[model samples]
Target: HMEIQVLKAPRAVVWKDFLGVNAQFLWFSPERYNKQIDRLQDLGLEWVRLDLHWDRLETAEDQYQLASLDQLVKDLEARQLKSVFYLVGSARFITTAPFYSPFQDQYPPRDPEVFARRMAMLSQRYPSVAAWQVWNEPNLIGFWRPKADPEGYAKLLQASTIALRMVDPEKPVVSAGMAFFSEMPDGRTMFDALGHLGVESLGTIATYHPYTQLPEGNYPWNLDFVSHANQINRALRNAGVPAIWSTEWGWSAYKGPKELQDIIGVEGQADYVLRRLALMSALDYDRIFLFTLSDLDQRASVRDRDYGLLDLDANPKPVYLALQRFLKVTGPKLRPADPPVTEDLPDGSFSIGWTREDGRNVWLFWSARGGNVRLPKLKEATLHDPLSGKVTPLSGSDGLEVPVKSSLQMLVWE
Candidate 1:
């Protein structure tokens, strides 16, 4: 098993919250943005993600406007918050596209060395920046215009990684997530596309996004998507990266009758969020960031606005409270029993275990091909309800029933 390095990081997870109408929150009067930072701090969140937009940063080959970023860093530091920059886009001088599709920034840099120097400069300047995600979803057409160029992306990742390490060797350079899982015309899965090109290896942390849905289809647990990618990626390099981070995974709660987009209802969204968190934790992804802290009212897509843990009005959804407990309370208490012990029970049931750091042991049982499962006899086992926070002790040894679909239980015992 790989060491779960990030489970011990300050926050242990990440969020992709941007403050702009197209980053309008970006232009927020300094006073308003300060209050927004206060709200983020109140959530007990430690890190925030930002796009290190190249075009926005530089107008000419040699000149750069890093002052805004500096102010961002300054504010984050004052609030005791950390930042992770997703280095994205290339300056217009490097692009073949006549103009951005509004602001569709992609196309590789004209020179890898120049990109490296700029990257190294940033690392040198911001000693407080925690980590860097190399680029945004190179696997997608919308982001990586002129189509996904695996060879070019490999060069970009390698160059920036080299530059970042020169300034802060131990600072992690994570792979830009393969936004959506698909293959290009040449028949390479996004996971293998990087190495398929000439690059020999990847950054320290592998990253991806796996959004699972409620209607149990052939693949109910999409988190396993990471496992498949990790296996293929490592095989290509013939070496192991330290860890994998599912930096963004989300499901939105549709509000209107329009059946607004690719997610479930409010309650279903909450349920899915907690289950995804549990599944990701069980799989031991180094970190998992739920897409956003709060809904973005001005997003072009309904799906994006509905993905927040909080609703459009900043009211807490069931997911927000669940997340609060999951991270600050219960999650921290359960120390995963590594060299993992998992088992399959009769009737499409599976169970995973964790030793509560103190004394209790946690067993998560779920049924997909629904059937009966024996509740293991612990000295004093109690069923834990993640939602209601209820604990009911087991009195007798008998088979617990499961429905014709997915059912999950959180059981704890000393």
Candidate 2:
């Protein structure tokens, strides 16, 4: 029999907190919004991460238009789905401020106080919001105009936190997420500068987008995706910022042959997504939000839409189906019983063990060289193929042995 011992209690977060996806409901028509919300609810997604467009809301001075955002918050509240509003973009009135891109929305305000006041107002108006992320990828040149400035961002974050707490002290203020793998000028990495900038003084949750063109648990690239995240966590913890979230990470279906390109097709998208989701869960992130829901076909870049799980028509792709299957098989109510364990046995096979909410055990087993792995005897067990959406029952004495492949297979037993 497999060893089943409780080390301690799991983190305070529930299983529902891990089910989040990026979306922009403020721009969607009522008809489309209804359809998408219904689908998301059916898929068991409990959280929605949206961009609260500052440019559209605070168009002129203190005068603001809140109809779009108000309705969105109301609709999500009606559905019982929580919200994480990513405070993004600049007001059109702040044109005097310098910008890196031709689009004026990408740069920060000339005065941090001005930005803080807007954030405080929003927090006071919508107290039901689950959390507020201060900004998008501030480390990226496209988002943080005039190049990435950690010190400047630290100021914005501190000001935002101070202003927001004046209205709602309990609500969470997340730091601007960093583009962990993006190339920076002069080889400068903003993630490494978090400790030095004194962001820990704000006592807010840190966030990052550790996107990779490779699989989440693959050998060298795992160094970039999972291990790199672990490394960042250590630094943040040492600096007194312990809480972290992966707000944006996904594998696109775009077929390309360039350095920044991802050639993974739809099938590969399904495979990599499930694998990544599993890895994120095992790593015990505070929360993890997939890149997006529907494809942004109207966007100028092809890779943008490719990152979406649903096509332009809002039809579910194979990746969506795979996630659906994973949710059902794993059961959203099930919590982690222990910290997940990864091991490389003498037989040259890799395996991960995760004790579920109950005494149940689930393992993700795979071998790069492709070989068979033996399991301890079990009276009841099921093998789940997340990619194919297939579940096979195992019984009798012969069921103890199973084949392992390059891709992962999930095995659950009582």
Candidate 3:
């Protein structure tokens, strides 16, 4: 018998709940918007992370067009879903001169004061937002423009945080979800550079996007997302950040040359969904927002498209069913439980027990190598297959035996 006491970091009480989906509400058609949100609510997702692009909302100096964002907030509020806004991109009036030609949105505001004022206005406008994310992956050159500089990013975070605190002192002010592997000009990883510069202390919560092309497992070269997150969390805590949220991370089903893009099709993608969610929950992430709600468009770059739980037609993909099943069995908030005893083989499978808010015991298990894994006996149990969405009954004193594979399987008993 062994016990694993899950370590939870302190966060704003309002965001203690788990499970959210990264959404592009601004991009959705009027018809598709309702259906997609309905699906998220049905799956029991507690939060939605969406972009409130500065460029789109503040088109010109001091002038605002917030109808779309206002409507989005209302729609989410009506469904009782909490929201986190990614306040990203540069407004046209403040767009940098001699910018990266094709991607003007990549530029940061030339004046930190201008960005701070805009953020302050939005913070006051959306009192309902659970958290305010200052930027999206500003550590990456693609998002930060000309170069990724921790010094410049630090000033922006400080200015925005001060502005937000003036209006909403209690709500979390989140730093940009730093790209885990991005490098700065000084031969240090962007995250390391930011930490060294003390930018982490400026935000109420730190965030990371830990994307790995390889499937979930213990691998060398720091190529696994789980270990990468662990490393980042340790850094955040040491730096005195209150909590960490995985703002964005997912595997791509599309075949492309990008780092996250893989040839994992529907079933493969579904398998990853279960494994990633199970592992993330076990590790005690403050919240897990899967990279997207649905595939944004077929017209997007192959690398950029097809990470969604839903396909382009707005239909649930296998991954969607996987999430539905996982959430149905485990519920939205995960509380880790220590099983009295779980027999383990040397086959390299992983398992962790947790309690539902309703107090049922559930254990999630998966194997890197295929094997028949057995659990500590239960009076009676139900097994859930995330990929196939199958529920099976098991009984008797022999304990629960399951054939484990790359896909996650959940066992629940009274």
> Positional deviation of 271 in candidate 2, in angstroms?
0.5
* Candidate 1: tens digits of C-alpha lDDT, residues 54-168: 8788876667887777887787688776667777777777654656355435666778777777788888888898888777788776667777887777877888888899898
Residues 1-414, candidate 3: write the lDDT tens digits. 332222232331112267788988778775788788777767866688888778778878778898878887877777787888878888877878364488787888899878988888887987888888888888777888888878888888899999999998888898888775454555777677777887766756877777666545435233355555677667667887777788887777776564545577778788877777666765636777888888877566786688888876678988888878777777655555654355653255566677777778787776555667565656578888877777888766867666666567788876
Off by over 4 Å in 3: 1-16, 181-187, 200-203, 215-224, 255-260, 339-344, 375-380, 395-400
TM agreement with the true structure for every prediction? 0.77, 0.87, 0.88
Count of clashes, each model: 6, 0, 1
> Top model by TM-score, which number?
3
> Candidate 2: where are CA atoms >4 Å away?
1-13, 95-101, 181-188, 217-224, 255-259, 333-350, 376-380, 395-399
lDDT of each: 0.59, 0.72, 0.73
Clashes in model 1: which pairs?
19-25, 19-26, 20-23, 20-24, 20-25, 21-24
How high a TM-score does candidate 3 get?
0.88
- lDDT tens string, model 2, 12-125? 335576768888665567677767777787787778888877888888877788887788788888889888887877897764355454778888778888888888888888
Better of 2 and 3 by TM-score: 3
